[PDB]
């Protein structure tokens with residue numbers, strides 16, 4: 413969730 | 423093919439340099455004096471700590487400091503993971519699961535770079551907190567660091583460098599045996615390649631180091647136990663010390679973890 417945010421930031 | 427395995431090794435090293443401001447090379451330089459006048463401030467007791475903090479109870483402020491630094495570490499490690507070839511094409515829930523279950527093993531791997539038998543570099547290399555001071559902290563907080571010293575000392579005796587560490591950490595992240603993984607096979611194919619790359623790196627970089635690859639793989643096992651013990655301590659703190667809590671990013675990681 414915050415992890416998903418970190419994983420998809422470019 | 424071995425040229426492809428070397429390209430992979432170098433790409434992982436390049437990505438490690440881009441993801442982690444503090445490398446083992448720089449840490450060891452500080453630890454051994456091979457930089458400049460700016461020798462680290464030593465924290466060995468409570469006066470030291472007050473003096474150092476310049477430039478709740480003590481155990482709890484140290485706990486809260488490590489948790490805050492842990493958040494930044496998760497972020498850097500996530501950035502690194504996204505540079506492992508194939509990783510960002512994995513199902514996103516599987517990416518989350520690999521990070522959730524792997525990030526702590528990587529944290530303790532990299533913390534070892536900052537450690538010797540006598541203490542740990544803190545504040546990005548500007549301070550040095552002694553092993554005996556951390557040990558002096560009241561239970562349960564005094565139990566955090568000591569098994570990591572035990573680990574770091576034996577791990578650092580293998581003399582891995584940043585180039586070796588980059589592949590080591592990728593191998594760990596791409597572990598097909600994490601609970602709740604949806605597609606194990608593409609993870610295992612990536613890991614299989616990483617392992618071949620690691621095997622070749624260790625042979626070329628440490629040609630006379632006896633059974634270094636085997637000893638390394640064994641360390642990946644020992645990290646899981648380090649983490650289990652760490653998480654049990656966090657559980658105790660949650661149950662019995664509840665006057666406080668983790669950062670939301672760490673809460674996510676810890677939710678339903680072991």
Ligand SMILES: COc1ccc(Cc2ncc(CN3CCC(c4ccccc4OC)CC3)c3cc(OC)c(OC)cc23)cc1OC
Nearest residue numbers: 444484485488489491492495498532533542544563566567
């Ligand atoms: C009393 O309470 C505790 C006592 C000990 C601990 C154990 C502990 N866990 C995590 C970090 C974060 N660190 C991981 C390595 C990371 C790192 C190092 C080098 C390179 C990359 C990198 O991260 C990406 C940088 C950030 C720590 C950093 C420390 O000094 C800086 C430290 O000094 C003793 C102890 C640390 C947790 C406690 O409570 C939770």
